[PDB]
Amino acid sequence: VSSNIDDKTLHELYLWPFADAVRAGVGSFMCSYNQVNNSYSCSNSYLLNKLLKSELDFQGFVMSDWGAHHSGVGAALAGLDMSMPGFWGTNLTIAVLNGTVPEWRVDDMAVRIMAAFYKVGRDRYQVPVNFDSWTKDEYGYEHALVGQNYVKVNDKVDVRADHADIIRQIGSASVVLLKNDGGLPLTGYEKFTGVFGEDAGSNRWG
Amino acid sequence: VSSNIDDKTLHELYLWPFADAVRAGVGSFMCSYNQVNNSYSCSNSYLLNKLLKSELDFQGFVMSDWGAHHSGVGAALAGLDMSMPGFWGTNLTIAVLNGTVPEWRVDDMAVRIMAAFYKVGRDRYQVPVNFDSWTKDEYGYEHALVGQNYVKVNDKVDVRADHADIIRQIGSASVVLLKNDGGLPLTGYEKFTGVFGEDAGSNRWG
Amino acid sequence: LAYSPPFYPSPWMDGNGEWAEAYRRAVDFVSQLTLAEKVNLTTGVGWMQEKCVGETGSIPRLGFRGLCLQDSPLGVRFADYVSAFPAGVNVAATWDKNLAYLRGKAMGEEHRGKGVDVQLGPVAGPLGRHPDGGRNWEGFSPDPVLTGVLMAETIKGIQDAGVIACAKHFIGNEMEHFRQASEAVGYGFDITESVSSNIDDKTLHELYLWPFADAVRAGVGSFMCSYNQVNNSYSCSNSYLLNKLLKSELDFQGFVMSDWGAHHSGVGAALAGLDMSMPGFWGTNLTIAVLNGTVPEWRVDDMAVRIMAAFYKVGRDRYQVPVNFDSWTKDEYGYEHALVGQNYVKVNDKVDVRADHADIIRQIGSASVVLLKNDGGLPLTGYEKFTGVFGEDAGSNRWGADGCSDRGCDNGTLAMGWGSGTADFPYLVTPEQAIQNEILSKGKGLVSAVTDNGALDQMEQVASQASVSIVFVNADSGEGYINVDGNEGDRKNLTLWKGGEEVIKTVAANCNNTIVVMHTVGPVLIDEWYDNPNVTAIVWAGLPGQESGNSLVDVLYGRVSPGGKTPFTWGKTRESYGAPLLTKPNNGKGAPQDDFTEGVFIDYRRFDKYNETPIYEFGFGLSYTTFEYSDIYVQPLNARPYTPASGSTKAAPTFPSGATDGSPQPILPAGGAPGGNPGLYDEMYRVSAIITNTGNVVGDEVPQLYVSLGGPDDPKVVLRNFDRITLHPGQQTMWTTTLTRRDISNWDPASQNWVVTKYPKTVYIGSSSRKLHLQAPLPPY
Ligand SMILES: OC[C@H]1NC[C@H](O)[C@@H](O)[C@@H]1O
Ligand SMILES: OC[C@H]1NC[C@H](O)[C@@H](O)[C@@H]1O
Ligand SMILES: OC[C@H]1NC[C@H](O)[C@@H](O)[C@@H]1O
Ligand SMILES: [Mg+2]
Ligand SMILES: [Mg+2]
Ligand SMILES: [Mg+2]
Ligand SMILES: [Mg+2]
Numbered sequence A, B: 001v002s003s004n005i006d007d008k009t010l011h012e013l014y015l016w017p018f019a020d021a022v023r024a025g026v027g028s029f030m031c032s033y034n035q036v037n038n039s040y041s042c043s044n045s046y047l048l049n050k051l052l053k054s055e056l057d058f059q060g061f062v063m064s065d066w067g068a069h070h071s072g073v074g075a076a077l078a079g080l081d082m083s084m085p086g087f088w089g090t091n092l093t094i095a096v097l098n099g100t101v102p103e104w105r106v107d108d109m110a111v112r113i114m115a116a117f118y119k120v121g122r123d124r125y126q127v128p129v130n131f132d133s134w135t136k137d138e139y140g141y142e143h144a145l146v147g148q149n150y151v152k153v154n155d156k157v158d159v160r161a162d163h164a165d166i167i168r169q170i171g172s173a174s175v176v177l178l179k180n181d182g183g184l185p186l187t188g189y190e191k192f193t194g195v196f197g198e199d200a201g202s203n204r205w206g
Numbered sequence C: 001l002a003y004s005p006p007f008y009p010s011p012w013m014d015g016n017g018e019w020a021e022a023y024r025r026a027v028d029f030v031s032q033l034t035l036a037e038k039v040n041l042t043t044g045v046g047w048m049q050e051k052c053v054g055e056t057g058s059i060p061r062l063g064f065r066g067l068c069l070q071d072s073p074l075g076v077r078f079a080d081y082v083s084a085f086p087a088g089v090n091v092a093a094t095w096d097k098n099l100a101y102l103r104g105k106a107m108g109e110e111h112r113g114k115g116v117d118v119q120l121g122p123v124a125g126p127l128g129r130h131p132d133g134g135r136n137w138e139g140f141s142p143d144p145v146l147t148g149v150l151m152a153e154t155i156k157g158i159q160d161a162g163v164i165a166c167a168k169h170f171i172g173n174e175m176e177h178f179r180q181a182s183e184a185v186g187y188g189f190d191i192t193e194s195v196s197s198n199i200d201d202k203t204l205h206e207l208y209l210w211p212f213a214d215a216v217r218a219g220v221g222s223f224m225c226s227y228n229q230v231n232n233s234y235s236c237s238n239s240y241l242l243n244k245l246l247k248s249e250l251d252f253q254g255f256v257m258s259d260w261g262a263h264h265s266g267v268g269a270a271l272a273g274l275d276m277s278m279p280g281f282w283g284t285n286l287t288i289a290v291l292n293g294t295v296p297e298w299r300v301d302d303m304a305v306r307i308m309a310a311f312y313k314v315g316r317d318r319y320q321v322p323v324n325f326d327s328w329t330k331d332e333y334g335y336e337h338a339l340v341g342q343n344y345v346k347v348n349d350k351v352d353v354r355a356d357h358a359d360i361i362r363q364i365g366s367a368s369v370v371l372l373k374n375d376g377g378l379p380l381t382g383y384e385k386f387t388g389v390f391g392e393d394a395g396s397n398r399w400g401a402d403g404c405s406d407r408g409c410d411n412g413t414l415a416m417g418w419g420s421g422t423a424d425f426p427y428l429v430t431p432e433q434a435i436q437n438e439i440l441s442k443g444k445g446l447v448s449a450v451t452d453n454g455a456l457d458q459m460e461q462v463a464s465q466a467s468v469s470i471v472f473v474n475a476d477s478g479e480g481y482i483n484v485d486g487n488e489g490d491r492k493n494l495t496l497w498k499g500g501e502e503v504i505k506t507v508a509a510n511c512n513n514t515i516v517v518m519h520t521v522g523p524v525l526i527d528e529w530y531d532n533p534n535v536t537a538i539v540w541a542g543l544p545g546q547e548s549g550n551s552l553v554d555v556l557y558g559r560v561s562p563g564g565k566t567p568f569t570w571g572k573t574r575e576s577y578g579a580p581l582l583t584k585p586n587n588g589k590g591a592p593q594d595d596f597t598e599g600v601f602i603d604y605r606r607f608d609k610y611n612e613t614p615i616y617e618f619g620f621g622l623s624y625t626t627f628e629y630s631d632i633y634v635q636p637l638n639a640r641p642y643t644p645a646s647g648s649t650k651a652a653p654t655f656p657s658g659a660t661d662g663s664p665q666p667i668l669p670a671g672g673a674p675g676g677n678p679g680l681y682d683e684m685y686r687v688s689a690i691i692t693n694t695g696n697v698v699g700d701e702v703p704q705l706y707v708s709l710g711g712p713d714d715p716k717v718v719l720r721n722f723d724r725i726t727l728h729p730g731q732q733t734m735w736t737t738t739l740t741r742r743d744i745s746n747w748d749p750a751s752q753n754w755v756v757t758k759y760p761k762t763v764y765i766g767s768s769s770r771k772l773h774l775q776a777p778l779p780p781y
């Protein structure tokens, strides 16, 4: 689908919060699956080169949404910096050697990515990836140069800390009271409390 | 169905705990729906007159199970004292006036019932029946001499007191550990607890 | 509270006219009986104690077995190897006296073959006060004339076959709610007495009583009094109802039985006109009452002779055979207690009584189809390139045709409502089966049946490809002891069941040639879809019994032109019909009070009074051809002036004020013979019109005669006559009928008689209650 949005509407509505994101120092952007004015976001030069990287002067890197369509090497020239989830590598290398993509573009892609990395201090805070997205298993086989290895893929590192507190707090803070004709608050000393609706209960599948 | 039980089996098995009940001073018995040796319990003279009221020397009163079959007024002669849930009334009266049921028998029925009443001190502890079995509604219509009354049928008297404690305690005391190869007890500091089965969950109907 | 005045004594039989011979034979029999034997005839044997739904005591001394009383109005209930006939409402939709008669004959034959003495049917009560009344489908029509006529024909059919028929339920059992206290308690209501139908004298006479008068005059052997009260007296001990209306004014010569466990004043019921207690304490109390003089000898003698007169009237002496089935098991053998030990006996002989009755069932099925809409949709050819069949109502009951107790479910195609008014299907031909057979025997186009109402994706898919889409929807109801999906007998709404409306909408969105077939116990609200231009045809097929699929396709594919007319109104809203069911007790713990305040204004009378336009009016139905009406003519017949009945009864023979008076009694002015004063049936006018088939195929028309009685409180029009006529293309016929005195009269409470009022009367002949093509005055004389 092509989202057909006029310049004024973009600026006064949809672009506005993204401007805030840039000014807040966000390290990366993700260009969307859809087209804008019949150009895919991830190879839309007006969107990425003009609005994001000129007007809003974004200094970080732009990645594609996962398999978001773009004009390959053309996307790089239109302001894309990173292709996800991943041909691009080969074509980009070839494009630089043959002059279709300038050396300063690939240099800019690399430096934007590394700038984001250094900006938040990944050099300090980086630890090995200690979980696996695709299994909960502790161990899994992996292909080697010779045969296979059996490697630890999940360390079960408990990062929850005391975060249950802020979750409970934001829960309470996000409750919106829309009507109250003497119903709330309750005391806990009511003689008989009825609770109704599946939305009160458990997911029976866990 | 007729439960066909010989004299020895009755005495050494089924009758034994009922003898204990008699000796514990229980005020009433309920005769069963089934037959014993092809005589309904509630008009079984061997059962009521001999075993219960002679051998075990029960002093209290025998009621029928609800609509338990018996030979009408013949049941009173065989040791029945109270017919539940309720013909019997008018037939029994006629039986006394006829001389087919002795005066001393109906007198014994009444005195057995009142003896139980006094034994446990109902004269001191009786209060109005403050609930209704057939509705949770607070009020209901009732027929009067003239027209109807709308009467309070449920007072919602909370009698639970602290009984939740003994219920919890008996729950815990009634747990039987049949196997334990290092499984129990748990600590509550287990890293991941899985709970499985509908028997763990709620009645979704309340 | 409404009050029912007493009427005593309880009239004894006359045994005149068509009852003379039965009376003589009855007297000859009862003269030989002891008091105990007489009382036995009046006493049910107890619930489920023998083979039949009910049985009387026997008289072994004379080799006379107990009577076998068996449901239902549409077949033999419980027994195996029987037929499942279309429901009464289908019979109403035929508007066909001949078919009504033949169905009665076939039913009576099946009962006879099983050894049944009394068929517990047919039904004129409920008449159909409410569109959502649970048991209306067992009856015929809210119209008293349509019901009365077809009631009479059904009765004659049954009794000509050699079985006693039973007119039920008398009277005012117009809904299931609160019919019995125990049943209401079961549904969470707190009442100790049944609802009271509060009906005034005029309303009774001009509406609810009318079809029962026809039943009496048709020679019906028995009556069943209802569970409800009328003006705060239980029907079965309501002396005004039984002694005055039924046995004096209507001069009923047969016997009255109670409905099963219907409340009455015991011995007092006998004095108030009850003759037989079902399912049966009554016996010993009645004996005691005779011996101690509270019940006169003549009353019990009359009870006995009324029962035996019915027996002899239909020739039970000739046609009785042993009861060769068992209601309570399909087992071949079973045990019965003897004086000593037990006997092992045959209980089911598996007597196949079906004969050729599948034919009449298929025919009545087709004749009861009402074409409500047709914008070039029908008939089909069977050479369509792709036929889609949609809706659970097209498919099979996955539990088997008889998989639901007393049909107490809405599984698959609806061919029968639920409750006592049932019979077991020997088989059931579904629309799915019949339509597939039609295609594969002709053009062999594509055909698919999506019979899960939730499978809307598939319905879109298939309907998108179809040349024609045939959509099936239903709505069910029944007796109050069965609750299906919150419908406690009565319908909780007039919606199509199981998301049927959504099925129609989904299919119609994808196919511009959508046919809708409705299998409903009564009207449903169709306002949202009937006028959809993608819906090219609409039919109502009702409850067609075992041959449903076949009888339908006969009409859909043009072998039979539809000729049915709707026997009730299709309105825009529930409110169109009038006030809701009384479904909330309004007298505390006492008898709910149900006031029939609308009077005679039910169904089309109501719509007409308030100038509301029905979607489909009473008496409306389309054809594959067209008809024209012309040349109405009224001939006055100069009948003898009406003479009120007078004179006395005989003294009560032997073989509350007035309850024991066996002295000669005065004849009521509107009484004097079965069905009322015979002067009521004098023909006053002959009315004629010409019907022409102006179309291209043979078809049936149902011309209808309506009368404006002309008073301020009278309906604009009331149906008075009808016929079903077959006409070839171009063929004309003169339709000639007569109007009786009763047809042009009003009940006058003051004089207790029927009166022809001063207001000018108009007669109409047309094709529906609203399509009144012809009219003429009824000139007074
Ligand atoms: O899962 C990765 C990626 N999938 C596609 C989603 O649009 C995006 O929000 C997400 O981050
Ligand atoms: O509900 C009353 C009564 N019903 C019958 C049961 O057998 C008995 O245990 C119970 O007390
Ligand atoms: O089944 C016997 C009897 N039950 C009660 C019903 O109202 C009646 O129609 C039926 O005949
Ligand atoms: Mg810049
Ligand atoms: Mg003793
Ligand atoms: Mg039996
Ligand atoms: Mg036949």
Ligand SMILES: [Mg+2]
Binding pocket: C011, C012, C013, C014, C247, C248, C251
């Ligand atoms: Mg008479």
